[PDB]
Design a protein around this ligand. Sequence first.
Ligand code: NA
Ligand code: NA
Lengths: 989, 989
Amino acid sequence: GRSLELGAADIQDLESFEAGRGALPARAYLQSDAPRLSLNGEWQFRLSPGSRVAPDDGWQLGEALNGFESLPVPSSWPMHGHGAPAYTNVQFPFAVEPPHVPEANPIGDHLVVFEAGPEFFPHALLRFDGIESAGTVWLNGVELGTTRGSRLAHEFDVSGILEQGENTLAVRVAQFSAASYVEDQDMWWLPGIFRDVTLQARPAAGIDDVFVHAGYDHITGEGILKVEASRGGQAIDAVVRVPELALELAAGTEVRVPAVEPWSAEVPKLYEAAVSAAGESVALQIGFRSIAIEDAQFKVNGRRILLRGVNRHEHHPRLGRVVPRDVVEAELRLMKQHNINAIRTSHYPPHPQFLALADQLGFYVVLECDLETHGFESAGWAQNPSDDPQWEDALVDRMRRTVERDKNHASVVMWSLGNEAGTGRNLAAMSRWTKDRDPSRPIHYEGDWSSEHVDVYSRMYASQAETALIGQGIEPALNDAALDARRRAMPFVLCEYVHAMGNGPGGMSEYQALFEKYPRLMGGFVWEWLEHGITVSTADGVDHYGYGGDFGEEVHDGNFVTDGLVDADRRPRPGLLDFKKVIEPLRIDVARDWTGFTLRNGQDFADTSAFSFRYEVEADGGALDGGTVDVAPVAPQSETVVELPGSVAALAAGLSDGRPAVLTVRAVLGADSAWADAGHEVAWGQSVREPGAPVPPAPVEPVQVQDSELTLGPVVFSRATGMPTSIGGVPVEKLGLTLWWAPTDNDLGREWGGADERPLATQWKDAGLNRLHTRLLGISANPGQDGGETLTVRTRVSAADKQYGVLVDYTWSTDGETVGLRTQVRRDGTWVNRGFEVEWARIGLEFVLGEETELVSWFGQGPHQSYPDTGQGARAGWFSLPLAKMDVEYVRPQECGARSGSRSAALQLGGRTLEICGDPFALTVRPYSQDVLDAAAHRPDLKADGRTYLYVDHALRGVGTAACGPGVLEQYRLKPRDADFILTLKVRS
Amino acid sequence: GRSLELGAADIQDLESFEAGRGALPARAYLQSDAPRLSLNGEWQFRLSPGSRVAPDDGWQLGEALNGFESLPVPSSWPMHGHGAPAYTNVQFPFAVEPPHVPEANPIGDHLVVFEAGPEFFPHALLRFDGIESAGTVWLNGVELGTTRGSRLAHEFDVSGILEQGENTLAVRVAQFSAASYVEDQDMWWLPGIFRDVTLQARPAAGIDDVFVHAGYDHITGEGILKVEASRGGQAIDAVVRVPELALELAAGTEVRVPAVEPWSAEVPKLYEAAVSAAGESVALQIGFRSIAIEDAQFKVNGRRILLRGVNRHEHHPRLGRVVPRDVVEAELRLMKQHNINAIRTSHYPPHPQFLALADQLGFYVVLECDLETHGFESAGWAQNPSDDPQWEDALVDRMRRTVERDKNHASVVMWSLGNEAGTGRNLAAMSRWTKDRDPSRPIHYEGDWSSEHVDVYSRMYASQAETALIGQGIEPALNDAALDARRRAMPFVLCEYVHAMGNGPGGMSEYQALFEKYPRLMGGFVWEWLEHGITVSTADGVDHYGYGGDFGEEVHDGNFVTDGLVDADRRPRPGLLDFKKVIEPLRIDVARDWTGFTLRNGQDFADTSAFSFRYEVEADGGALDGGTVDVAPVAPQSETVVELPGSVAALAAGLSDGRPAVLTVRAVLGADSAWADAGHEVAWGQSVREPGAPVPPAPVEPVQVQDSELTLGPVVFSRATGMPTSIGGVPVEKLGLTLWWAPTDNDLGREWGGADERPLATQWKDAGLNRLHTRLLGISANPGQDGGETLTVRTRVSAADKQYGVLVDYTWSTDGETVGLRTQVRRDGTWVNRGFEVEWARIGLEFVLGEETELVSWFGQGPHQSYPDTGQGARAGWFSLPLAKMDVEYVRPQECGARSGSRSAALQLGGRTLEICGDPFALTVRPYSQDVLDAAAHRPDLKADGRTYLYVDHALRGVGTAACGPGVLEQYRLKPRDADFILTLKVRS
Ligand code: NA
Ligand code: NA
């Protein structure tokens, strides 16, 4: 019997089910006049590969340091060259055997020397706001305690250890600990001290914790205020002063303020208040709100509200978990600018400073505890911590610390027990505690569908259909009659829906229609706000985002970090633009006769008084008229009809039959707000006078036959191919039918149900839809009129080893000036492969041109892209973009850039402009081919070859959200069918 | 109404269901004294991308050629830079719509000018032996006709077109034609004139075709001879002279020769004969044989024979379909050297010159017609030519031309209608014709399992089990009572089995046991003889074989061309070495007491008289004794017992208890034969005296504990890891358990049946078996004896996101000189993933050493590799190889190089030699890691890193033949279980 392994005692600590030891009781984050010293700055940093290899050179004392270097704190140290980021989603990065930790466990030693003034005597504390995932803290070689709960705050008492003058603070941080088993969220695994380390003095007769109770009686219009204040866990005498309400009360007593302005996301009214004791005073912002669940509805201040929300992770493309305050203010303002009123802190408490901003700019906030045991799902939740009693104290500590920190803020309207932790005893323990401490807020958890220990029914990525059932209260009952009776009486919320990976999300409209129609639906939260992209510079110094698997990770999920509405640098993806329109607070139905418009106010509290209503009339290359209309304030959930100036309606009948004109009624801010400047666009509506169907040119031109070529009008053909080689001088290198997209991220994912287990992208490859070949059948010339000949090229399209195909015929005609192309498409054989019917991505034509396009113009829906289930934010008008701005810079290159519902388009090539008219078609123009687009793993992989790839699609497919949740809806799917369309071509040289 | 496409008439020809027009009636390939002129040499060659683009510049006349260049003929023109090779297997390279051809159809114009002497007047013909796939032939601007049937010979009459003096011959060749639909074999698609173009004069009163009927009466010992000779399709008077049999008869009459020596693969007795007419005489080699199907047995000359065969494609690594005669002679001799007696010409007639060689060196030849419509299987054989009456004449022409060419040869014992053409009317038409023309030979076809139109029951890749049933005649009956009665009375043959892709094939022994035990089993043909590798030179001029998909092919099958017993350059893969032993014609069971051996003659005709029997006794580094034993000739299918010299048996009892000695009795050729030199090894047998289990060293050495390291005997450890860092001075960089191979080609293929659809390679990746991590549990030191301490390192092995694992413990001990390692392995949890139990590839240890190994020695089975279901040819002995010769150069790098059944091994590193002893283990040594081996797509991807990767496996897995056909057999599979083994380590410096 003998023992000889190194670092045993260190690991036993890492493998404890105990919460952080030594730390003071959990309290709220308060703004205090008590002297503070921030220890943020250059610290000394040493990295070790394991705990068994971690040096014991008494480094904690700060002198004779071996191998240390300066590292900024707070920070995520992989972001600074020390190691590399790693990313997994459903999977753990280590062997699952709780609570044991792997041998490859990066240990980062942190050290800093600071001097402490007399202000921090006799009593003071150290406050860590976040250490991932386990930390041991020494002050002048004395162990203070350990920290567990990476996104939770720990405070240690340094009274009697802190010396006057220079002090030495040493923190040992381990990446993986037993706590890693309960923090399995969807993100890069980035260890380190990533939040503020703070030294704060604790005066005698000071305030340790404050609990604010600000309620609103919507009937009597009275505020109900009562402020608890305590020191050392016991209630104390303190004075509460609210200047604006002109009152002065003692803590612990409950008074009713006669008239208060209630708080909401629409009107974030806050009252300045201070809680004063002898030793210190605390500064608070008080918002009067009351939350009730009544008649299966989630109500705030008496009225049902609609959550238009997103899921906000904390991420930066260069700093790790560190999100600079200016960056936080920026994104919150951006959310407000796009009609967002709710946030779910997924899947952990955010930076303490976040809560204040959510109070100030109006947001309904779902504050989620730092708990996710998603990696145990793989094995049927065997060894799940949520049900293991060994984990009870540790998990309850996580809930307590979460609730305690942010209880005072009005924005927090719900506590959430965590994400995807399964079901268990501990979850029930966590809920039970929270209902006892803070009854003012309902409780949210998605994992337990029985909804036994929560106040709202919550699901993620439920189908539009399923939601429609739940909204009507006719969803299938639970086995338990008692439990079903409770859940059927709960409001419903989608804590995650419309996955926004890559091109998408689609189907956002079908969800919103249900949100507006059924009171039981609270609305919900989009997944997610931002991409977790990380900036990388190449050998030639191109920088682009990188995703999972790009940093050498043994185990990864590729590009799933990229599912955001904005990129890592907070630049809006087209999805956010569409989202803004879907959840807009006002609906404007412009009448067809342009006499007036119908306006409905979709807000729950405010009226249409902060808005200014403008109208615009666009036609050709000029705004024909503009102005402002006077709209009497409209009550919330009410609608009126506003008549437009007679001048507008007069211009309608005034314009010629068949030329396009667009009437736009826009709701903009009357004056500056905290989150936007005046004139900012909130909601809009349109009525469009569309051009009639174009007329095919006179077939009065004959076909001139030479030895190897044909000529008709300005179009030169090839007698071998049957395809044009030149139109009005523009080099046509290729023309063919396309049935296939470059697979989006939605296509790469398996679809919800169905006998076909294969991702739609795979279905296409097996069907050979990406490798189509054309066989020429014959070229006819047929009489038109007055010597005119109409050329007809008959072809068949198919792929290798396939017996099915499609017959397409191109009949050309021209009056000598304008070229008329007609395409007929017929199915040859049954399109089934591997026992499943093959779906198409499009019915369109690919034009490859030998000259670059300098600039693209069109009339239809823009500026950004449009697909059948998307492009809601794309409005009618005239748009002109450089070729470079046509594309969309998704992290992983895929199908994007299609402008649906086009009527006409113009491509300028050198000195020539190519006009394309016809029936509604979808426009796409690229500097590179699809084979290039598909193959590309990153943006740099895309090199232009000097050609112009023009795409004109008759019918398109929906993009859906198949990456996670519902795929393409039925009405948006594209199955094999026979089709036709006419085009109008012309070249102005 | 009008038509304007180019090259319409050319394509209509390509799309005809008609056979070659203009060609003379099919006849046999005869050696004639009639004057011949070979036109092989430099020709002029022009390539065009399509038939619509193919120039009509009257190039056929040979002057004012534009864009021509010199190209050798015969040749495959992609092998000469003109285009590139393309490879598919089951799939067609173009859209399936018979008989239409793609637009991308390479057209190669061939042209040559030759002068013709007066000998070729007044009558002569042009003979093309092979044009792939369609050819049009002009002579001096006159169209002779077209050729259909790429591996079939066409002859055109040039009488009255051939001028005296200079003539100009022009051939237009198209790669794809309607005939491509019926030539869908497993190979590179290589067009061109790839066989001899020949000019032959046809004298008056000459012989056009000869049919030889040479039968053998095994009862009376009489030859039955009758030779038909004809001119212009009508019988003529000719004189047959057979010098050796001293007879002279007139053609058309049937005589019985009193005493003839019969022909067989074992005794290829041929009689010289000449058929003389006035104008010319024909030289023939006559072999007397008779084929009968009787009592469900395939009989030749009265006796049941055993087909030990292979499938021979015609391929060269540099020339395409062109296989030089010296290369053909070479491989045929190589086959004979490895006990092969049968060949299946897959899947087309071979070069005309092949048939003669198969007569001379003894081979049973299955001659297969050029027909495969395998690409229609994809769509349930819709539009299958085999059943389409439009194809009848074309398909019957293929059978006629095939039979007619090679009817005279004795080696051809069966006509085969083709491969994988499905079922149809035309197949029945082909059989019906063949039975009428040549009843002397049975008919083979695999596609129609009902076996309605054939003479033998034939299957491919049927399981060992299924074969065992068929052998006993108890296979499940057919729906048709009448048909079942016929098929149940047929002999059975596997036209393709034991797929030899990559490492393998395994399970060859279990098949052969059935072949020997059941008379109904004819034996069968291995797939296949050679790899279709193609030589490629890199930027630094490394040359290596390339496979499908490596030449830019839109559609491919990767490395499936690589499934041979030899590489493209006819270098034996280990599979051939194993195969030679499995099908050896003699079995030698050496008695245990070394007194004698049992010898059985497995041949059907010959006796043991051409052999010399040698014996050898090896022990340590010396052959102790050698000699020759006198064995009375043993009759075929009979066995005798031969006593060894008393000196041998005396040496057995003479040697110490526990030292190894190997007795080898070997059958070698007494004198030179046509295919090998005297002394060549045919069959062998062994009896082995194995060393006793090694004894664990005295645990008398204590553990010396320092700060960061441990020391026990000559082994230095690391206290952090628990792994040795040094043994006797050799740097040990790593030591760990392995459960995973680098997936072979068999592992990459789906397995036959089972709920698990996943290839075994994929099963491993999902299970995380390739990414194992170890967690240290503890290091103990326990008392041994006399101050001795036995170190024990306890660890656990697992992978990320997995809850199952394995507990392995390493207990070390040493007497100061020899190190004793013991490994205990225990399963922790159930090894199931995705609902399926996880199989292991091995139970072994990986040693990574910081020094290169110069040379590896061992005692066990060698020289080549050994796996549970393979290594039959690996014999017992002492082997020593350079590290470079340990590896096996498979085209795609995979698991290989394991020497199973090892007893001891020695690795020399610089000046140190490392000895490893113990229980039977499998040895593998590599210059690179497994991660390198797996990732490598080609041989060049393998770069040594200066380390030595040593593998010692307790238990191994079978390789099977899962790439196509049966996977690993039950007794060879490796499932999770608890195991142990002891090792003996020692370093001699
Ligand atoms: Na995600
Ligand atoms: Na093959």
